[PDB]
Write a protein that binds this ligand. Sequence first.
Ligand SMILES: *[C@@H]1O[C@H](CO)[C@@H](O[C@@H]2O[C@H](CO)[C@@H](O[C@@H]3O[C@H](CO)[C@@H](O)[C@H](O)[C@@H]3O)[C@H](O)[C@H]2NC(C)=O)[C@H](O)[C@H]1NC(C)=O
Ligand SMILES: *[C@@H]1O[C@H](CO)[C@@H](O[C@@H]2O[C@H](CO)[C@@H](O)[C@H](O)[C@H]2NC(C)=O)[C@H](O)[C@H]1NC(C)=O
Length: 308
Amino acid sequence: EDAPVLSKAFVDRVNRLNRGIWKAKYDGVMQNITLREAKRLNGVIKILPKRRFTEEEARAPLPSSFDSAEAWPNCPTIPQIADQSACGSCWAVAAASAMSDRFCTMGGVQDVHISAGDLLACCSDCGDGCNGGDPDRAWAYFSSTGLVSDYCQPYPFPHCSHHSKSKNGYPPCSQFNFDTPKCNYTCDDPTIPVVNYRSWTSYALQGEDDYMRELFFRGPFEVAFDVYEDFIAYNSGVYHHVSGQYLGGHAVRLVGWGTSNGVPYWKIANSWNTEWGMDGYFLIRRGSSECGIEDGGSAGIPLAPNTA
Ligand SMILES: *[C@@H]1O[C@H](CO)[C@@H](O[C@@H]2O[C@H](CO)[C@@H](O[C@@H]3O[C@H](CO)[C@@H](O)[C@H](O)[C@@H]3O)[C@H](O)[C@H]2NC(C)=O)[C@H](O)[C@H]1NC(C)=O
Ligand SMILES: *[C@@H]1O[C@H](CO)[C@@H](O[C@@H]2O[C@H](CO)[C@@H](O)[C@H](O)[C@H]2NC(C)=O)[C@H](O)[C@H]1NC(C)=O
């Protein structure tokens, strides 16, 4: 359990087997991560109505590549990469990030960051905080209860690095194990007034076409996939699973699609900060539910604040 996940030999095997379609790297940022730690980063554990597309949506000829940041270039939350830190809160962090993106693509508010802290601590229905939770219930909680912004309640755990000498001066993740924070009802600075943000509807997505089409019209949303040990070593290219044991479910924010040398893929924002993968992003094979990635998405529509 305090054993390293990765070895040079494991990585060499992965890179033989993957045929150079993606690159695994041993002495990357995850070189020394242990099994206990790697498992804690995957915090998906465990219903919404299915999305229905109108006749118009359904007949759109979707382009052969698409990137949310290019399609909504005035929405500054889209390209930001989060850091869930030493806590299994991806389910909440990928939800909050996408909710912030959607306030801009749909909800008329250019730059509000939805608080993943509030959701993590207060949505007890959703799961068990830092020990993991359920993406779908997170979206349902955004409708029924609503969430404050991170200006009100900032994410309570600092960035941490799996490198021993972090490029960004982040402290080591191993020196931390965090437990679910207490749910609060005022902002950290109590003189900042509580502003509550809410969606009016939530829904589930399934399959390559649903996903593409939802992304095209409405923008980023949250998906989950199975994490194997070879994923830990990902450095670049279009991932697909070739070796390693199952490490758990992980939620992430889907932001784009394309094709690279004949391989269709999804572009995805991870939440392990910008030191990991391709500046915080990874590509993964699209079209064949690689590691279950197309088995269920969760999304919703933010309600615009105030009135006209
Ligand atoms: C709700 O408010 C509570 C109470 O203020 C927030 O709890 C506080 O969270 C911070 C950040 O983790 C904790 O800081 C730690 O303090 C310990 C002991 O002083 C120190 O050794 C650490 O280095 C770190 O500074 C603080 O202890 C903690 N307070 C309590 C009572 O647990 C909480 O995070 C807020 N909830 C949300 C969702 O943000
Ligand atoms: C993983 O752990 C090994 C060994 O601790 C790291 O290697 C040490 O790195 C520090 C700083 O780079 C050096 O001063 C030591 O000489 C190294 N020790 C040995 C035995 O190699 C390695 O840097 C760690 N890798 C990462 C990415 O954090």
